[PDB]
């Protein structure tokens, strides 16, 4: 339903190996991917042209054997499960890839902040600059920060517990399927963005 | 507990300033909660206006005389009565002619004493009249 | 700052506005009895290889070996009791916060 | 510490509260009265000296001011404060009408 001029820049692509990223997908997924990144995928071997036989069934990369010996039949339940697994992996990758940015006020050049942060603020900035919606109950601070939350200025890190790990079976490729480490950098900013 | 001891050692603001900062963050959160409200609200005629309200208890607030009227039921309960009051409602300062077919003997004050003339008003601290009717226009 | 007599405001309460070890009670009190030759009034806990000292009289200007600046203050951090290598209080607080008091 | 300066060079006298107490117990009360007075009156020698002479310090309990009949002034310190304690649990007394209805 895209416009023709916009669709001219995209091409239908079937994913062979699960790739994380704004232009990625799960193994056996059809998506409109941009020309440059789609050509990169097809040159690397992670993508295939969506023929009808391939839409029926596909071969995929096996992590254990390191070869494209995994034949897969594209079905509805398979698509649903793989989409959910891709969502879980994308959330993990987003929260484990880069820094989180906080900007607040602190009178003077002290080391502690004027107003300490909380799980609500952490989840707010997560949804803001990561586009990930989570509830504050999953955010568990460090042993020293269980009292007053994030208070130091500079660099800190918190734990975020992801419940859905063993149901989908991610414990192999992921470092730790139980929780993830969110690195948060807190700084002093101008008034309009500090707001406190 | 070296780390938390050192953190408790150094602080940029005293306890009272930190209390005021927490009050500031609470005011900001209240502003955000207030802004998160919807734009409009679909209400009915017969039901009182204070039935769809979303919301320090057991006491009388400053808005008691207003929430009494908000809790009491509405007066105009139907568009029939609403228009039956509107069609009788009339304006005076409206630019243009006005209907007079009701009674012929009556003359409006504008037609009777012109437009540049107004009745003398009792000017005192209690009641103030509008001044310079010439400047009153545009 | 000085806002009272030593009967009410101690000498180590002058730097109460600065963050760090000054906001605690010093361990050693040389202000009573005989006076020191260098006029040191207090000495805090020896953190690793650094120990803080508060002088008396006008601030003796010294050179902090960490920042390299001449610093005029009453607070001086001596490294391993060697009085040739001194630190201003700002570098001392930063060294401790980074956890470099044992290394530097 | 209680310190002061004399006219001689290096005359920075520094005595402990214990030393001032073993010298004269009234000296401590007089010093603290002088501090509490100079807190508000330090500009005028009159306003900072005249009040102090109205205090009648006495080490022991005996005192010759029995004719003036001094009233036993009562004063409450600003420290008294009741921190919140656990609500004590006790049995509730019911009512026949409450059990009926």
């Amino acid at each position: 339903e895209m416009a023709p001029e916009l669709q001219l820049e995209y091409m239908p692509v079937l994913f062979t190996r699960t790739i994380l990223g704004p232009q990625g997908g799960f193994a056996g997924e059809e998506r409109l991917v941009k020309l440059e990144v789609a050509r990169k995928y097809m040159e690397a071997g992670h993508a295939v042209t969506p023929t009808e036989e391939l839409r029926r069934g596909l071969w995929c990369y096996n992590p254990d054997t390191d070869k494209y010996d995994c034949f897969i039949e594209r079905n509805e339940e398979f698509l649903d499960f793989a989409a959910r697994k891709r969502q879980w992996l994308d959330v993990y990758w987003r929260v484990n890839t880069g820094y989180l940015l906080f900007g607040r006020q602190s009178w003077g050049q002290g080391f502690l902040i004027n107003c300490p942060l909380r799980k609500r603020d952490v989840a707010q900035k997560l949804w803001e600059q990561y586009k990930v919606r989570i509830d504050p109950r999953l955010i568990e601070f460090r042993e020293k920060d269980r009292r007053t939350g994030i208070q130091e200025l500079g660099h800190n890190w918190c734990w975020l517990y992801l419940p859905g790990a063993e149901e989908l079976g991610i414990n192999r490729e992921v470092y730790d399927n139980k929780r993830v480490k969110v690195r948060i950098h807190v700084r002093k900013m101008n008034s309009m963005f500090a707001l406190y | 507990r070296y780390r938390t001891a050192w953190r408790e050692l150094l602080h940029p603001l005293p306890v009272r300033a930190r209390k005021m900062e927490w009050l500031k963050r609470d005011a900001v959160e209240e502003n955000e909660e207030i802004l998160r409200r919807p734009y409009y609200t679909i209400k009915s005629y017969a039901l009182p206006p204070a039935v769809g309200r979303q919301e320090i208890r057991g006491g009388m607030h400053s808005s008691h005389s207003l929430d009494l009227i908000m809790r009491q039921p509405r007066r105009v309960k139907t568009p029939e009565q609403l228009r039956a009051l509107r069609d009788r409602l009339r304006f005076i300062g409206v630019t243009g002619p006005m209907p007079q077919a009701t009674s012929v003997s009556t003359k409006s004050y504008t037609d009777t004493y012109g437009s540049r003339l107004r009745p003398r008003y009792p000017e005192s601290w209690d009641t103030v009249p509008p001044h310079q009717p010439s400047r009153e226009l545009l | 700052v000085q806002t009272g007599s030593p009967t009410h405001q101690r000498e180590y309460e002058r730097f109460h506005h600065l963050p760090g070890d000054v906001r605690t009670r010093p361990q050693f009190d040389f202000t009573f009895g005989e006076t020191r030759a260098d006029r040191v009034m207090f000495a805090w806990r020896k953190r690793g290889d650094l120990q803080l000292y508060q002088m008396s009289g006008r601030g003796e200007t010294f050179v902090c070996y960490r920042c390299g600046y001449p610093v005029r203050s009453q607070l001086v951090a001596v490294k391993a009791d060697n009085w040739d290598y001194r630190m201003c209080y700002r570098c001392y607080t930063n060294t401790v916060h980074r956890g470099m008091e044992n290394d530097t | 510490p209680i310190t002061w300066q004399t006219a001689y060079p290096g005359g920075k006298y520094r005595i402990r509260l214990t030393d001032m107490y073993e010298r004269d117990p009234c000296m401590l009360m007089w010093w603290f009265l002088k501090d509490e007075v100079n807190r508000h009156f330090v500009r005028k020698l009159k306003t900072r000296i005249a009040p102090l002479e109205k205090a009648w310090l006495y080490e022991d309990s005996i005192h010759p001011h029995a004719d003036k009949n001094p009233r036993p002034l009562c004063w409450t310190d600003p420290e008294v404060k009741g921190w919140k304690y656990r609500d004590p649990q006790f049995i509730r007394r019911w009512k026949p009408n409450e059990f009926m209805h």
């Binding site: 003077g108 | 005293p14 | 000085q2 109460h16 506005h17 | -």
Partner: peptide, 24 residues
């Protein structure tokens, strides 16, 4: 408040006005 490192130290006049009593 309490100034940090970069802010210069300024000595203000002692508040000599009469203060009310701190009742409990």
């Amino acid at each position: 408040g309490f100034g940090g490192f970069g802010m210069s130290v300024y000595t203000p006049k002692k508040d000599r006005r009469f203060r009310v009593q701190p009742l409990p």
